Symmetry: D2
Subunit: 321 residues, 4 copies
């Protein structure tokens, strides 16, 4: 039995101690402490001796988190081979690439769409992206799409979202890009509905100038499912809900459940959504092993993920080098 | 300037008047009243005759579905098909009241499986360990027996054998929408949303069709009968062209995620939808597309600047049947 | 075991049947069906033969619901003695009275406070109240406050929020007012923090012109607690959270739990709030009897309450006359 | 025009830099960065010397608390006192960093009871039937033994005897704030928020003080020793005058409900707070005051039009300690 007690600032300000005290603060602060423990357990397992490791970690995140600064946090983990599989939606891929061409700016949620549109600005929450960002994206992308169609028709290449994402990361060739690092470190990225964003727009426009590109999603299902099936252990770290959450969980259901699971999302369960489902619902399905101790932190990941990474993965920088 | 005033039950339980009074009740009841007006505007426009010039442009699509003055896109999350909203959606599709459907994997497969075995009411608090030990799967406060997926597997596998065969010998190029038309044809049951969708030439888009039970089956099946390819590129052209050659477009989206954005993005291609009604529980504070207000979509050009979009913040299991009752169901005659 | 099935519109449109089908629709539609059952059970119990009745029903609602049209729904129940005790916060009292003097208008959530203020308009969600409403309120209220101070000092009256609310309902003398009906039918209204609103503002200003008004909250605690203690049975219908929810639940804890409980609110549990607590938390405290089958509908009450009343209380208009 | 950019862990775990980087991270992390700036502006103003003219006006209150250039109101919901945020709040009050406290009943009593017996960590899913059978009470994912309230009763009853005695023989006129100062004096424990509040002349307002355990005790006690009166009218004058004669005011509100509105309403009396930071989980769609954005308060005049209010949409158990760490705790010296 642990007593409730928050950090005493009379000790002054030691950030490591402040974060550790969340565990005994209550509510989501406590779930955060539990998440720190579970992610550390995943890491300890991954570091256990038996490129396969003792724990295959699946990292999932929604598109908007890549628009946010969490893009740097994710790039760090991938850059240092701290996770093994990435799952994100379409915006999650393209905005990482576009950020290497032009920046995203801070704004406000209340900015009116009429005025923003008249000024050629697109709103993403309290962030802003100029139309010009997509124009630079198009110029950068078109010639790569041409090579892709050509390799497909003359070199037998059977594109899938994951193969395309590896290619784009390699093409962006910028150390700031999550996907540049992913393909460099052989970390696969799955995105079944990769056509649902600006990269879709471009593939669409491009098909009328150079028809034929095929993106198969069946081979990619085989690829992600086998990542979980042949794993010694698996851990799931999912920021947000939707396709990203279910696609990673369903892959783990194929091995009869994940050994560790930490979720950070704002969805609520009352609407029956998969996004808002507590990890306990996933246990009924077999997505999470019955003996696992899954953790869900109900919070905006822009606030929580950097702190979680600080108290876990960043503390093991050594082992990961 | 309308005054706030709720329905006065001293008038008795006059349901039509009760529902109309939501418009002046406030908060989400008022948003509901606005959604009703917007969906009715969508319907009024759809029933408008196509002029010679309009008809010329709208007919520029390959689809054999009869052109209308307002192409209505209906999107909904998987769980709503597990819920009884499955009957509400089937009704609209059965009577050609909407033109394009967009749903995620669970949204397709659960409609089919419901033709083989039912879904049951449960509780949100039921522990996963006990449910699993008892071969039961939880979806919110609903329950689905493991057995449901076994029946699905038996029904589906032979169809997948045929599809691969057709792909390799007849040169078929499968995409999620083509597969969903085929499955609906195969289920051949009037209680199925997709049976009616293919019968009425209403295309169904699902870019991440592999993310669910149907994906499980395709996966297992691929090991005995390898080779099935589901291209999502052709399907993007198909859904976008539906928006591009529309005289007018209306969007009715239940829930968020891929379903919401895929419809909005198709409409960005025509520079915005003319009408939009959203019913979802997501909030905007986390910067999610799901939780974004319609006004965010206006900045992108997904909703025309002159449109008067509406979002009802509520569980669609409660709101959608009421919305349909005050809009589409009132125009049943016109649709027959 | 009940199968999931929604209303089939091929039957055409029968509203009674449409509402009944919510029970088998799933998610909150089902909780709504359960709420209909529980409220009907309360009513059936109240109608059971033994002015005490076989079931004392406590109706609680937050201030904003009185700003909304739910004000008419509540007035109906009180007008016909369908509930026995009312609990609402300060805005919940004053806005009912003010609505008899000037109306509230529809607006939008996005209206900017700067412009609204420059125009003398106050925003409440997507509703609008002109400053002039409070001026009429002040004119109406001042002379009543004078009588109250006088009765207190010369007639021994010991004011409490509930006594004041009865007096104001009687003074507004308008059949449209919830409180006019409450005092007419001897339905007490509790509001411990009655000073937290415009009526507080007025009591404040008035005290400098005619000092001395005392509002005791201790006697009112005795009054509400004894309402639950001496009840044969009790049912709780609570719209929203906060003081309104806890004050009714705590009164029922004094009789070892309510027999029936139906909650309609948008609060979530993750932040540890009492507002967002599931009814099951209340069972741990003894606020709800262990054998009760409490129901919570996660939804905006402006949408749900009129429907609930239609399928329950309004269906028994006869018995209540 | 600031660009979006998150902290780069390649720089190592530099906590100060990590927290600063929240400002350019986006969504609520950015709102956090803004809250930090706003609370620091509040502090910077509070440390500003009072001019002769200012000092004259600010000294027009009866309170013996030393006038400052910015009167800061701190509000928080009951459950946050049950949580470890109780230590965060006690720290601020202990060092005179805030001037007025507003909390609900549970927010007062649980601080006192924590001096007699602890609160324990639990889980949200623990069933009420079993907990009750075991004499345990649940508060979110926290646990409080029935025994805690027994100890409270033993500690409190004698104090209530004295209070009634003082009321009847010494003519004391109790109000929630006076009772809370007395209870804090009585608990005489440096771990108590209220002990420090009364020691440092920081008034605590709670209009609905009867809504909790302390109300239970007053209720039971009234039957053996009848007569205790708690007037809420005097307390409204007291809290309003604190805002009216302030040179500047800042509002820091954790959670919503009475605590949020009571502070905002006091500030409406001076025509608005100069600074405002909110940290709550409520949403606006239901029209609630709790869920209202700061901009709604601007329409009322509760927040000055020129102010730049901030709301962080998050559980304060996670955010408040971080906020305090980057603001008040950095100025510890100045407050000693
Ligand atoms: N960034 C964008 O807004 C944008 C841009 C282009 C395309 N898209 C497309 O929109 C589609 C739907 O987006 P999605 O599925 O990635 O996610 P989403 O934005 O729809 O979010 C899904 C859910 O994840 C949770 N969530 C989101 N942000 C969170 C946060 N900061 N912290 C915690 N939980 C959070 C919420 O509960 C939310 O309802 C995608 O398929 C994608 O291709 C996204
Ligand atoms: N039925 C299921 O739970 C289930 C079953 C099998 C597979 N899946 C898979 O899960 C993946 C993610 O699911 P999804 O994208 O369909 O949506 P989702 O369940 O993740 O919900 C997305 C968002 O829509 C809103 N929403 C959901 N239910 C709502 C309701 N009742 N009323 C109003 N708004 C509501 C919420 O904001 C929610 O966060 C899908 O790709 C799908 O293939 C679903
Ligand atoms: N109407 C106003 O905005 C206003 C006006 C004057 C004074 N006040 C004062 O503000 C204080 C705090 O207000 P409160 O405690 O009455 O409530 P509130 O507005 O703070 O709401 C409390 C909670 O109730 C729930 N809720 C509110 N509206 C709901 C709805 N439509 N449907 C379902 N759940 C809903 C939400 O979870 C919300 O967080 C009160 O003490 C009151 O005197 C209110
Ligand atoms: N600790 C308790 O649960 C408890 C104990 C005894 C009595 N009470 C009584 O319950 C009544 C109502 O409680 P209340 O007014 O203190 O508030 P509350 O618990 O009802 O919460 C009000 C709102 O504040 C927000 N909120 C709550 N916790 C939050 C958090 N961790 N982070 C951010 N925002 C948060 C939420 O929007 C919530 O709906 C009080 O009058 C009090 O006397 C409380």
């Amino acid at each position: 039995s642990t007593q409730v007690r928050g950090y005493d600032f009379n000790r002054g300000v030691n950030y490591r101690a402040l974060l550790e005290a969340f565990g005994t603060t209550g509510f989501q602060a406590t779930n955060f402490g539990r998440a720190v423990q579970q992610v550390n357990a995943m890491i300890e397992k991954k570091l256990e001796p038996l490129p396969l490791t003792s724990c295959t970690i699946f990292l999932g995140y929604t598109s908007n988190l890549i628009s946010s600064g969490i893009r740097e946090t994710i790039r760090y983990l991938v850059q240092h081979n701290m996770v093994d599989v990435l799952v994100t939606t379409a915006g999650g891929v393209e905005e990482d690439l576009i950020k290497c061409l032009a920046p995203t700016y801070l704004g406000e949620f209340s900015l009116r769409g009429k005025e923003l549109r008249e000024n050629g600005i697109n709103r993403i929450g309290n962030l802003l992206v100029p139309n010009e960002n997509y124009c630079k994206f198009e110029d950068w992308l078109m010639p790569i799409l041409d090579q892709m169609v050509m390799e497909q028709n003359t070199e037998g290449v059977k594109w899938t979202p994951s193969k395309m994402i590896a290619r784009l990361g390699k093409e962006i060739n910028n150390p700031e890009s999550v996907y540049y690092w992913a393909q460099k470190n052989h970390i696969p990225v799955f995105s079944p509905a990769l056509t649902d964003g600006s990269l879709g727009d471009m593939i669409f426009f491009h098909s009328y100038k150079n028809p034929g590109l095929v993106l198969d999603i069946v081979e990619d299902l085989r690829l992600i499912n086998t990542q979980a099936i042949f794993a010694k252990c698996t851990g799931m770290i999912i920021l947000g809900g939707g396709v990203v959450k279910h696609h990673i969980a369903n892959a783990n259901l194929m091995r009869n459940g994940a050994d560790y699971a930490v979720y950070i999302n704002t969805a609520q369960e009352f609407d029956g959504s998969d996004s808002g489902a507590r990890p306990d619902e996933a246990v009924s399905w077999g997505k999470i092993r019955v003996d696992a101790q899954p953790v869900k932190v109900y919070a905006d990941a822009s606030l929580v993920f950097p702190l979680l990474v600080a108290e876990t993965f960043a503390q093991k920088m050594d082992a990961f080098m």
